[PDB]
């Protein structure tokens, strides 16, 4: 039967609490938290992942940056992109910016 | 190939997924001042909707308060409004009270 109590923080699956600031990006923090947990499940490594990479780059999958989004659209972006950058390499700005992975027009 | 698994809209299905998979993304109705000013304890808001969710959060576990005589189960939820909100940034959401705030209505996790 399922246990009576479960707390994945005790097992090392959860990063510290973050602050989305003045931006409607809770969908991105929910999605990075679930991805941080499944990458720890797979590899035993807990790394804070980038909500900014989702806010800036997952518009093709249906998200709207600081104007709202869905965790499933963020998970589709992760699979399309082959992963997600770390928070340390692609830090949070609490505003939608250009996706550096978009070549744009030249 | 979609990159995620959707959990059926039921708290027992969510409980099994949390126990077997790890933290799960969920959405809740966070549009009540009781949640904006939440500080501690099991959160129960009589006027919460199980259909109109507007805020994504992360279920990292579940448990129960043995010194409370009924309505004592909760979901352990990580929010993203910083550590000064709630219990160091976390909230204990009422569990097994008719899908309170829609916590089991839009639950999923990524495939890796």
Curated annotation (Swiss-Prot), chain B:
Highest taxon of the lineage: Eukaryota
Propiece residues: 68-70
Binding site for Zn(2+) 3: 6
Location of the active site: 55, 79
Binding-site residues, Zn(2+) 7: 54
Residues annotated to bind Zn(2+) 5: 29, 32
Disulfide bonds: 48-101
Residues involved in Zn(2+) 6 binding: 52
Protein's name in the database: Cathepsin L
The organism of origin for this protein: Homo sapiens
Residue window of the full protein shown: 222 to 333 of 333
């Amino acid at each position: 039967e399922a246990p009576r109590s479960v707390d994945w923080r005790e097992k090392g699956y959860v990063t510290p609490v973050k602050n989305q600031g003045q931006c409607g990006s809770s969908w991105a923090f929910s999605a990075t938290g679930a991805l941080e947990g499944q990458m720890f499940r797979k590899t035993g490594r807990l790394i804070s992942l980038s909500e900014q990479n989702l806010v800036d780059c997952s518009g093709p999958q249906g998200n709207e940056g600081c104007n709202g989004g869905l965790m499933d659209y963020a998970f589709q972006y992760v699979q399309d992109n082959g992963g997600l950058d770390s928070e340390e390499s692609y830090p949070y700005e609490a505003t939608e910016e250009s996706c550096k992975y978009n070549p744009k027009y030249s | 190939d979609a990159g995620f698994v959707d959990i059926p809209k039921q708290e027992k299905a969510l409980m099994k997924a949390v126990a077997t998979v790890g933290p799960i993304s969920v959405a809740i109705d966070a549009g009540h001042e009781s949640f904006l000013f939440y500080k501690e304890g099991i959160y129960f808001e009589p006027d919460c909707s199980s259909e109109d969710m507007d805020h994504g959060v992360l279920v990292v576990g579940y448990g129960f308060e043995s010194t409370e005589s009924d309505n004592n189960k909760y979901w352990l939820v990580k929010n993203s409004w910083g550590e000064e909100w709630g219990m160091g940034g976390y909230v204990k959401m009422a569990k097994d009270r008719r899908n309170h705030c829609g916590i089991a209505s839009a639950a999923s996790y990524p495939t890796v």
